[PDB]
Subunit: 75 residues, 6 copies
């Protein structure tokens, strides 16, 4: 015979305090950008990205994160 | 016979205090960018990225992180 | 017969205090960037990145991190 | 008595030939430009120029130049 | 008595030939430019120039020059 | 009495020939430029020049040059 008891406990806390947030600046790609092409052969798929792309500014007033996994597995 | 008891306990705290956040600057790619191409042959896939791409500014007023895994596994 | 008890405990604390955060500057790629290509053959996959790419500014008011693993495993 | 004769002569020529003119490029000021000021006192006249100013491109298909002066003076 | 005769002569030629002019590039100021000022006192005149200024590209298809002065001066 | 005769002669030729002119590059100021000032006193005139200024590219297809002076003078 088998007896399995799984009764974990958690009273934990994750916390922050901040007095103020501000005066934050992000300026990607201020210079001039220039592209020239002549006499090219492509016999297969092409992708191109030119300029100011995919840039992020992220300013959360907290931004705390908790991750928890439980995983019983049996035969 | 088999008798298994799994009863872990957790009272943790994760904590921060900050008096103020600010005057933060990010400026990628201020210089000029220039590309010239002539007489090229491609017989297979091409990808190209030219300029100011994928840059991140990230300013959390806390940003604490707790990660936990439990993993019982039996036969 | 087999009789197993697993009962760990945790009363830990992870903590920080800061009087203020600021006057932080990041400026990648102020110089000029220039590329010329003539008479090339490619029989194979190509990727190209030219400019200011993938740069990060990261300024957490806390940024504490806790990682924990439990792993009982049986036969 | 006075007898003065001034009778200069000139049969001279200035000449050019060019087979073609072209593919000329001028790109002043491709980089980013940035100016910040705090707590300044001025008790007299000020001038300021900021940016891309007073630049010239000049492509004459000839541009030959002859200057001549005759300057008699007497008492 | 005074006799003066001034009768100079000139049959000169100035000449050029060029097979072609081209593929000429001028790129001043590709790098980033940055200026910060705090706590300054001025009690007299100020001039300031910041950036890309006064640049020249000059491509004459000849550009030949002749200068000539005649300057008799009597008493 | 005085008898002055001034009769110089000139049959000069000044000449050039060129097969072609090209592929000429002038690229000043590729590096980043940066200026910071704090706590200065000026009781006198000020001038400032910061950046890429006064640059010249000059490509004549000839550029031949003749200068001449005649100066008779009396008492």
């Amino acid at each position: 015979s088998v007896q399995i008891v799984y009764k974990p406990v958690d009273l934990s806390k994750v916390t922050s305090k901040c007095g103020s947030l501000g005066n934050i600046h992000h300026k990607p790609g201020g210079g001039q950008v220039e592209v020239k092409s002549e006499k090219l052969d492509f016999k297969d798929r092409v992708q191109s990205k030119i300029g100011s792309l995919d840039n992020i500014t992220h300013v959360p007033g907290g931004g705390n994160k908790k991750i928890e996994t439980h995983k019983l597995t049996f035969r």
